[PDB]
Amino acid sequence: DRQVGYFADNGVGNPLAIVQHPAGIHKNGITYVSYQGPKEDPYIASYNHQTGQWQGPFRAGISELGRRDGGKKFDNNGKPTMLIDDEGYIHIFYGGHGGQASNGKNPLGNTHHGANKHAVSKRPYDISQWEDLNNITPFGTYNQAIKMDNGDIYLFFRHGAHRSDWVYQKSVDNGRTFASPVSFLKHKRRTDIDAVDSWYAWAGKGQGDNIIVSYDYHVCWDGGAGVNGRGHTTERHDVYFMSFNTKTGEWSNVEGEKLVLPVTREVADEKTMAMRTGELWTFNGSTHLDAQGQPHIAINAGIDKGAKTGGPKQTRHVRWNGNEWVGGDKVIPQYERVSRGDFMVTDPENIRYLTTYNQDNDAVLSWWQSHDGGEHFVEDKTVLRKDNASFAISAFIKDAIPDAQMLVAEKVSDEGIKMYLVGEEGAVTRSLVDLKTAMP
């Protein structure tokens, strides 16, 4: 037997992403981790930090996205999101890419395929057996699950495919019943161009009873519209910020001005814009408050090179300094390829990304540190590096301890993808004999 760096070897497509978060959660010395496995089904494992023993991975549910007739080989937009409720049941949200006509008429957007799903562990703190609840709307993409101190659960998602509002559904009974969706970002026809307002949001905990939300805007072009009829692309621009007080129900911008829901593009441009990116195309990151309560934002952006996705995009850091939004500088200086990363912030000046990037054909995951509020980052220790690969990463694990902070997927082909749990220094190893016994 020997220790290997990966805890599973069956990921497919993009098995992780920052937008489906938490992908893993730490509680009482156990780190729970989830990712997308064969047929895009959600898999979950756990690591017991005191005993050194892994459990799983176990399949938590059955995704429609892995059983489509044709189309893209892997969809990936329904990789799993995790939450542990106040009774210890583990919830997995997964499988949605906006539903389809068989689920009903989507009242808050359009559809594509794959009904959004909700599984729960049969017993508290036991990841081995699962049951379907599917008590949320099937018209969902991009699950983001937040539990407040009183146990209330907010599930944020897009209520359909591109041309849909973003919403949350709230549960006060540990995820067993959800209230109807509440729209907080509006999709609608533009009155100036042949496009629909569309959005991508990242919601996470703020301080107290606040939830904070960063988002970029998608210019959702009609077919044949746009410059020289380029049609529908992934064109996205800019980044915005607002806050949600879960005690009062009210939303506000960084200055505390209250917003009427759902927020339209026109109000967002007036009230919640954080950083314009000009002609640069964006891919959203995440947001976190510093120790003075001021929001920091990771936003990826890059030059449009004419591709359907524009071109490669690099992570940039933005922050509220108490009076104005500042920043926009790249985390990795002079880098022009693809980078992604999540960050931690303490004092407003002190920001650390764990970021992935490529050097030649190799994948790198390393820490980058700023002490000047995000204008300059310097690379510190490398946590994982793999030749002839690229990394998909999770957001930082909820309540992470130093040994287990982020999940990584070593993309080589689009199946058989090795899955890693990494900490300050490197991977949380698993016995190979144990892994082979457990797989799948």
Ligand X SMILES: C[C@@H]1O[C@@H](O)[C@H](O)[C@H](OS(=O)(=O)O)[C@H]1O[C@@H]1O[C@H](C(=O)O)[C@@H](O[C@@H]2O[C@@H](C)[C@H](O[C@@H]3OC(C(=O)O)=C[C@H](O)[C@H]3O)[C@@H](OS(=O)(=O)O)[C@H]2O)[C@H](O)[C@H]1O
Work out what residue 220 binds among Zn ion, K ion, Cl ion, none; the CB cut-off runs from 5 to 8 Å by kind: Zn ion
Own/partner long-range contacts of 183-186 (Cβ < 8 Å, ≥24 apart): 183/108, 183/159, 183/261, 183/262, 184/213, 184/244, 184/251, 184/261, 184/262, 184/263, 185/215, 185/262, 185/263, 185/268, 186/262, 186/263, 186/264, 186/265
Residue 234 binds ligand X (CB under 6 A): yes
Listing DSSP states for 140-170 in one string gives -EEEEEEE-TTS-EEEEEESSSSSS-EEEEE
Residue 112 binds ligand X (CB under 6 A): yes
Contact (CB, 8 A) for 116 and 139: yes
> Which amino acid is residue 388, in one-letter code?
N
Instruction: Between 153 and 213, name the residue whose CB sits nearer to ligand X.
Output: 213
Backbone torsion region of residue 228, taken as left when φ is above 0, otherwise alpha when ψ lies between -120 and 50, otherwise beta: left
Nearest residue relative to K ion (C-beta) = 18
Instruction: Between 18 and 161, name the residue whose CB sits nearer to K ion.
Output: 18
Q: Considering only residues 297-316, where is the footprint of ligand X by CB under 6 A?
A: 308-309
Give residue for tokens 């994948």: 363
Instruction: State which of residues 313, 352, 386, 418 lies at the interface with Cl ion (CB under 5 A).
Output: 313
Residue 252 binds ligand X (CB under 6 A): no
Q: How far is the CB of 37 from ligand X (least distance, A)?
A: 14
Q: How far is the CB of 99 from ligand X (least distance, A)?
A: 11
Instruction: State which of residues 138, 175, 312, 327 lies at the interface with Cl ion (CB under 5 A).
Output: 312
Q: Distance between CA atoms of 232 and 248, rounded to whole angstroms?
A: 39
Instruction: State which of residues 79, 163, 187, 340 lies at the interface with K ion (CB under 5 A).
Output: 340
Over the window 292 to 331, marking each residue x when it contacts K ion by CB under 5 A and - when it does not, the resulting string is ----------------------------------------
Per DSSP, the three-state class of 37 is coil
What are the backbone angles phi and psi of residue 93, rounded to the nearest 5°?
A: -105, 135
Instruction: State which of residues 68, 205, 232, 237 lies at the interface with ligand X (CB under 6 A).
Output: 232
Residue 76 binds ligand X (CB under 6 A): yes
Residue 18 binds K ion (CB under 5 A): yes
Listing DSSP states for 325-376 in one string gives EEEEEESSTT--S-EEEEEEESSTT-EEEEEEEEETTEEEEEEEEESSTTS-
Give residue for tokens 């209230």: 179
The span of 14-22, 44-52, 120-128, 219-227 binding K ion (CB under 5 A) equals: 14-22
Residue 162 binds ligand X (CB under 6 A): yes
Q: How far is the CB of 373 from ligand X (least distance, A)?
A: 28
- As given in the structure block, the two tokens for residue 88 are 């210890």
Residue 239 binds ligand X (CB under 6 A): no
Residue 358 binds ligand X (CB under 6 A): no
Residue 158 binds Zn ion (CB under 5 A): no
Q: Considering only residues 201-240, where is the footprint of Zn ion by CB under 5 A?
A: 220
Residue 162 binds Zn ion (CB under 5 A): yes
Residue 272 binds ligand X (CB under 6 A): no
Q: Give the sheet arrangement for strand 417-422, strand by strand.
A: 8-11, 417-422, 406-411, 390-393
Tell me the site size for Zn ion, rule CB under 5 A.
2
Residue 288 binds Cl ion (CB under 5 A): no
Q: Distance between CA atoms of 174 and 229, rounded to whole angstroms?
A: 49
Identify the sign of the CA torsion 374, 379, 381, 383: positive
The span of 71-79, 226-234, 293-301, 334-342 binding K ion (CB under 5 A) equals: 334-342
Cα–Cα nearest to 30, from 54, 56, 7:
54
User: Footprint of Zn ion on this chain (CB under 5 A)?
Assistant: 162, 220
User: Footprint of Cl ion on this chain (CB under 5 A)?
Assistant: 312-313, 338
